[PDB]
RNA sequence: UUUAAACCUA
């Protein structure tokens, strides 16, 4: 059990060269946004149970136009993960790796004109999990304010969310299957 | 009926 994660001085975590490093694994070098060039994480906030259930069944997600370019750019450069969060309750729904690039023609039936295109995903965990620290992370993910759908999060936010999801599921808390 | 990845592994 490592001590609580805090971003008040997260920018102060530096290696000997002066590069920003992760607070969770100091070997991971970050840019000045706290993002790892190798592993990148975006939040998908969603209240549509039809969409979420379709996504967990068919391993497809519709990407918003307002975040599609940054996600498409990240996919060509890094491993890219979506962490799915219920928009009103902040329950974690799971997380998945993006495994194909944006595609304007391959959109799920539930997508609308706010979406740019479809991506295939590979679910890593699925859940329906309430965790107070997950909810706190999502609540502060936009410079201390609530997450915006599709935004990229810092490496330590993504990694801690994956850890928290894995831990609960292993404790048989918050499973969906 | 759910080994996160990566990094590091004497």
Residue numbers in the entry: 312 to 488
Paper excerpt:
Mmi1 is an essential RNA-binding protein in the fission yeast Schizosaccharomyces pombe that eliminates meiotic transcripts during normal vegetative growth. A C-terminal YTH RNA-binding domain in Mmi1 recognizes UNAAAC motifs (where N is any ribonucleotide) that are present in multiple copies within DSRs. Surprisingly, Mmi1 binds DSR RNA using a divergent mechanism on a surface that is distinct from the m6A-binding pocket, including extended protein sequences located upstream and downstream of the YTH domain. We propose that the low-complexity region influences RNA binding indirectly by reducing dynamic motions of the RNA-binding groove and stabilizing a conformation of the YTH domain that binds to RNA with high affinity.
The RNA used in NMR experiments (19 nucleotides) is longer than the RNA used in crystallographic experiments (7 nucleotides). To determine whether nucleotides outside the UNAAAC motif are recognized by Mmi1, we determined a crystal structure of USR–YTH (residues 301–488) bound to an 11-mer RNA containing a DSR. In this structure, the longer RNA does not form any additional contacts with the YTH domain, and RNA binding is confined to the DSR motif. Furthermore, the conformation of the N-terminal USR is largely similar to those seen in the other structures.
